[PDB]
């Protein structure tokens, strides 16, 4: 589990606002979901190369044209999308 | 700066593979970026409602209808996407 005091400390490096305990909890939940799915994808990537060790190369950025299709296809898998993932995407789309 | 040891410990709850230091560092970079943009978007939602406190409601999901539209429009914005956001989106579109 991630330490809530550390997450809130980092949050307050990006805002002067007060931050509720429930808000910190929700970010921690999203962060844990991110750790989970990145690690699972990284393992799948190490497997494709026959490795049993996750390396930096297993966290990938697809070239812009493939990632553009992959996002467009994702736009139509929202109805069964985990809440934590919808929240992440809401943040990413609200920020850009 | 999240503690890299505890992030790797969370990773190992989801994979049996070894994990290199550089992989842990990469994920930590992603997590720090997520903390930043989630807090920045949260503050904006707090402001829109006249508050100076980030609450759980500011880490939000709209509808599956508005989210679907923003994910479509996100697909046309790869060029302004920082690498860390691209890696997050690659993970999300590779996983589930």
Residue numbers in the entry:
A (entry chain A), B (entry chain B): 1 to 96
Article, verbatim:
Archaeal histones are dimeric and assemble on DNA into ‘hypernucleosome’ particles of varying sizes with each dimer wrapping 30 bp of DNA. Here, we characterise the structure and function of the histone paralogue MJ1647 from Methanocaldococcus jannaschii that has a unique C-terminal extension enabling homotetramerisation. Unlike canonical histones, MJ1647 tetramers can bridge two DNA molecules in vitro. To the best of our knowledge, MJ1647 is the first histone shown to have DNA bridging properties, which has important implications for genome structure and gene expression in archaea.
To elucidate the role of the MJ1647 tetramerisation module in oligomerisation and DNA binding, we solved the molecular structure of the MJ1647 histone by crystallisation and X-ray diffraction at 1.9 Å resolution. MJ1647 crystallised as dimers and the refined model shows that each monomer contains the classic histone fold (three α-helices separated by two loops) with a very strong correspondence to well-characterised archaeal histones such as HMfB, including the electrostatic surface charge distribution. Unlike the disordered tails of eukaryotic histones, the MJ1647 tetramerisation module forms a well-structured region of the protein and is composed of two α-helices separated by a loop. The two helices from each monomer are packed against each other to create an interleaved or ‘hand-shake’ arrangement, adding considerably to the overall interaction surface between monomers in the dimer. The dimers in the crystal structure differ to the tetrameric state of the protein in solution observed in SEC-MALS and native mass spectrometry experiments. This discrepancy is possibly due to the low pH (4.6) in the crystallisation buffer that could favour MJ1647 dimers. Unable to obtain crystals of the MJ1647 tetramer at higher pH, we generated structural models for MJ1647 tetramers using the structure prediction algorithm AlphaFold2. While TM helices 4 and 5 form monomer–monomer interactions within MJ1647 dimers in the crystal structure, TM helices 4 and 5 ‘open up’ in the tetrameric model and make new interactions with opposing monomers that enable dimer–dimer interactions within the tetramer. By comparison, the distance between positions 80 and 95 of monomers within the dimer of the crystal structure (11.1 Å) is incompatible with disulfide bond formation. Overall, our crystallisation results suggest that MJ1647 might exist in an alternative state next to the dominant tetrameric state we observed in our biochemical assays.
